[PDB]
Amino acid sequence: STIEEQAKTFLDKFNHEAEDLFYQSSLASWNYNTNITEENVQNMNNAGDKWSAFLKEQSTLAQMYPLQEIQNLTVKLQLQALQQNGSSVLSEDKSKRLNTILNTMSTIYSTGKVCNPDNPQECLLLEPGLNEIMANSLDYNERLWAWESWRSEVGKQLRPLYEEYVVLKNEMARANHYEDYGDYWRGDYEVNGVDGYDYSRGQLIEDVEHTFEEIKPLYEHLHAYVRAKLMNAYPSYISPIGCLPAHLLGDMWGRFWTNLYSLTVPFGQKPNIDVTDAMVDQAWDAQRIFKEAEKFFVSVGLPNMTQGFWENSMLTDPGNVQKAVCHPTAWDLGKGDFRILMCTKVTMDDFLTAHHEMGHIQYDMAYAAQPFLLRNGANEGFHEAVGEIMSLSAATPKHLKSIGLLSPDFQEDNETEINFLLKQALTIVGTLPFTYMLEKWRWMVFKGEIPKDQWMKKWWEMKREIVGVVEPVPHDETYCDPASLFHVSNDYSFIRYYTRTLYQFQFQEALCQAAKHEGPLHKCDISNSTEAGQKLFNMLRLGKSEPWTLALENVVGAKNMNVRPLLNYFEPLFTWLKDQNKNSFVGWSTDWSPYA
Amino acid sequence: CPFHEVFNATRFASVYAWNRTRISNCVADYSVLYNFAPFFAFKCYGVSPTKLNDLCFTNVYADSFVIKGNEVSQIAPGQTGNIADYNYKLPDDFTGCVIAWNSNKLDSKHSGNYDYWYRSLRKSKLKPFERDISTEIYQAGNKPCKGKGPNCYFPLESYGFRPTYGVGHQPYRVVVLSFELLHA
Ligand SMILES: *[C@@H]1O[C@H](CO)[C@@H](O[C@@H]2O[C@H](CO)[C@@H](O[C@@H]3O[C@H](CO)[C@@H](O)[C@H](O)[C@@H]3O)[C@H](O)[C@H]2NC(C)=O)[C@H](O)[C@H]1NC(C)=O
Ligand SMILES: *[C@@H]1O[C@H](CO)[C@@H](O[C@@H]2O[C@H](CO)[C@@H](O)[C@H](O)[C@H]2NC(C)=O)[C@H](O)[C@H]1NC(C)=O
Ligand SMILES: *[C@@H]1O[C@H](CO)[C@@H](O[C@@H]2O[C@H](CO)[C@@H](O)[C@H](O)[C@H]2NC(C)=O)[C@H](O)[C@H]1NC(C)=O
Ligand SMILES: *[C@@H]1O[C@H](CO)[C@@H](O[C@@H]2O[C@H](CO)[C@@H](O)[C@H](O)[C@H]2NC(C)=O)[C@H](O)[C@H]1NC(C)=O
Ligand SMILES: *[C@@H]1O[C@H](CO)[C@@H](O)[C@H](O)[C@H]1NC(C)=O
Ligand SMILES: *[C@@H]1O[C@H](CO)[C@@H](O)[C@H](O)[C@H]1NC(C)=O
Ligand SMILES: *[C@@H]1O[C@H](CO)[C@@H](O)[C@H](O)[C@H]1NC(C)=O
Ligand SMILES: *[C@@H]1O[C@H](CO)[C@@H](O)[C@H](O)[C@H]1NC(C)=O
């Protein structure tokens, strides 16, 4: 009758009640997102409140089982999951104020709008208006207008809230025995109590910085290439030696360079692989796309989808009568009920997305046997890393030929491979300095290294040093540029995207070894090759029951993050870019700006 | 024999309080067992299914209960889990057949059917064919237990059955036929 046995009894009761309440909450959420109506809003909120009240009661009860006497790591991990109070550690007034601030920021971002000069009646929302301007317009002044208007009208409403937010979140984090809120976020990667696999919170910062330095030689060449092409697009606005203007990168924040592809195409006289016409000519629909994804997973040795998946999932747009959120998601409702919510259209992008979301569902299925509190990925970056390797494999020409969408006699050559790799580099590599610099900035803000009076001054210096992007106009301390992004205004961890990207390649290379693949890594197809499927499955079924360093070692042969698989993936692109840049400056000066 | 009153019944008993009906002084016909449902499992341990009509026994008992699909593998000699240990346990030396079928269309409701209870906490393992329908509060801690509380748990939990759950969490109706031989 020791404390460990009482804790195990407690957790068993928790897992049963939690599965029932969680299921009810997840189903109500599903019903709302697939059938949008006020009655479902009330049902979603009532089930959500029931779930939250349950967790608060169980968290309170969980404080009676100290972890110091517990020897079993599974029990200790489940108790850690329940004992943290989070916002419950704050006084009632600060908690209501913090939730007010978070709701205010969400409201300001979601409904923020700007108006055309001298035309108060013609006003654009971030989506689709400004995003469309930033993605498709080639008029320098229009792009700058959208940039500045968003930063002034929205950034200056969020700034004082971000200051109060940072203060309240740091107080909360300190009350939970963390150095700052940055350590709260980095606690997701903490391993403590497994000899040889331990990973401190502070260590995460160092590892990210080391991987970034290794990446730098590749990024600097990609950046320089893009600069030359943009010089032709904007002949009088880009310095051959300086940073790129932030508003010219193809997005609102410069998070991705994917929309610059049409200007930077290596060999523009040849097409990219696009099998949309093949899917239309063959009379494909959403059902065949999902069945082909299923065949992909079955081929590698993973299980078939359940009957409930095919009967309850919403794979097509319900139509004009029944509204739904057309944002692809993979749902695990608990107790064996797995669903995908997508508004599938016949296009190659949705084909790959179907593989991505199926890649998530297979993961949710693999760890379904774990205790309720451990039914998640090893860390925040594993779930998407798995989905991305599934998308990455499905896209290779070998796959398209084998399924029958790419012509049997299509002949790949090096110019097509370079066009493919540049597009991938623009979406995978061009986003890493952004994610690193942004997360690093927040860490320094929460820690207290950057005083409030220099938040933006320091922000722009870092952007120039790490990313190579310079503001087109100066900004004083009344602006809040970081908060103009969804993942900053709302309380989300952004490091997920840097870490996940490296994992994506670490897994893919190891699987390619299991498949006995020869030749360039980017052409690797892990179809069939049941050794790769079993290798991945052995990790996927673990959920959170093991340290992420071990879950990673079980697939790639290493206990930490690395970058070599990524650099190898893009190796022929790096060589090509080095060749293209022999007459160009590689790197950048931080003194030049469009302003001066 | 009246096998249809066991297999074809409006409601099966909860596994914590399984229904043991005794069949005696009768002529059995086991081919009718295949007229009630497609079965998840029909597994005999001490007898051959195809020879059931050639044996004579003094008593046959039909143990009727509802369990989860993932728990069907526990109705067997030598198994462990919340059911093999705390609700219904077969002896290691067992003569009989374990019949299970999917009942999702009859027992599940959208709100959730909470009228099927199982035991998860007990002081000791059950003996073969022992039944315990007590609702006393289980004491997990060292302090005397007075009602529900910090280390005081109700020993029974209900299964929430809903038509959309995966196969492993749908209700299954299980009938175990135990064949007993004595005299006459
Ligand atoms: C993984 O293995 C499967 C087999 O288990 C491979 O699928 C098979 O691919 C071949 C082509 O390489 C198919 O043969 C062709 O079928 C078409 C049907 O119209 C026919 O016109 C061609 O003349 C040829 O016979 C074969 O049918 C197909 N098998 C199945 C069961 O679908 C698959 O290609 C392998 N994966 C990869 C990436 O290659
Ligand atoms: C930690 O506790 C879990 C139970 O919560 C143990 O898992 C059990 O291990 C036994 C080993 O014989 C199995 O038969 C059970 O089926 C397992 N149960 C569950 C729920 O997984 C685990 O082994 C314990 N670990 C340590 C290191 O003591
Ligand atoms: C939030 O979590 C902490 C532990 O992480 C709780 O801390 C204990 O609370 C009890 C009262 O319930 C105190 O007697 C203990 O001294 C606390 N322990 C520590 C380590 O200080 C805390 O109670 C929880 N928050 C609230 C609001 O109760
Ligand atoms: C996965 O499910 C399918 C049904 O969706 C199973 O059945 C096969 O389906 C394909 C569909 O093209 C048929 O061509 C095969 O003939 C079917 N097989 C049989 C034996 O009839 C498939 O077997 C299931 N696979 C796994 C691994 O569970
Ligand atoms: C959508 O929700 C409303 C809520 O009243 C319900 O009546 C309707 O049947 C639901 N429709 C679907 C397709 O789920
Ligand atoms: C492709 O290979 C040919 C071989 O002659 C070479 O001349 C050409 O430059 C290569 N192109 C790329 C993009 O690597
Ligand atoms: C079977 O269960 C019913 C209630 O569901 C009960 O009335 C009946 O007496 C039980 N039969 C046996 C043999 O225990
Ligand atoms: C079971 O009972 C129902 C009525 O409840 C009847 O319609 C059905 O035919 C019966 N089935 C068998 C196999 O006796």
Residue numbers in the entry:
A (entry chain A): 19 to 614
B (entry chain B): 336 to 482, 484 to 520
Give sentences from the paper.
The JN.1-sublineage KP.3.1.1 recently emerged as the globally prevalent SARS-CoV-2 variant, demonstrating increased infectivity and antibody escape. We investigate how mutations and a deletion in the KP.3.1.1 spike protein (S) affect hACE2 binding and antibody escape. To investigate the effects of N30 glycosylation introduced by S31Δ and two RBD mutations (F456L and Q493E) on the structure and function of the spike protein, we determined the cryo-EM structures of the recent SARS-CoV-2 variants KP.3.1.1 and JN.1.11 along with engineered variants JN.1.11 + S31Δ+Q493E, JN.1.11.1 + S31Δ, and JN.1.11 + S31Δ. The spike proteins exhibited three conformational states: “one RBD up,” “all RBD down,” and “flexible” (i.e., one or two RBDs disordered in the density maps due to flexibility).
To investigate the interactions between KP.3.1.1 S and the cell receptor, we also determined a structure of KP.3.1.1 S/hACE2 complex at 2.9 Å resolution using cryo-EM. The local refinement map of the KP.3.1.1 RBD with hACE2 was also excellent and resolved at 3.1 Å resolution. Residues on the receptor-binding site of the KP.3.1.1 RBD are highly conserved with JN.1 and form extensive electrostatic interactions with hACE2. E493 and R498 form salt bridges with K31 and D38, respectively; the main chains of P486, F490, S494, and G502 form H-bonds with the side chains of Y83, K31, H34, and K353 main chain, respectively; N477 and Y489 H-bond with S19 and Y83, respectively; and Y449 H-bonds with D38 and Q42, N487 with M82 and Y83, and T500 with Y41 and N330. Several conserved aromatic and aliphatic residues (Y453, A475, P486, and Y489) also establish hydrophobic interactions with hACE2. RBD-Q493E alone in the presence of F456 would likely be disfavored due to an electrostatic repulsion with hACE2-E35. The bulkier RBD-F456 side chain shifts hACE2-K31 to form an intrachain salt bridge interaction with hACE2-E35, thereby reducing its interaction with RBD E493. However, when the smaller side chain of L456 is present, K31 can move and form a salt bridge with E493, which is a stronger interaction than the hydrogen bond between K31 and Q493 in the presence of F456, which explains how F456L and Q493E can synergize to recover the binding affinity with hACE2. Thus, we also observed the epistatic effect of F456L and Q493E in KP.3.1.1, which together enhanced hACE2 binding, compared to the substantially reduced binding with Q493E alone. Our structural analyses of the KP.3.1.1 RBD/hACE2 complex and binding data are consistent with an epistatic interaction between the F456L and Q493E mutations in the RBD of KP.3.1.1, where Q493E alone substantially reduces binding but, in the presence of F456L, these residues synergize to restore hACE2 binding affinity.
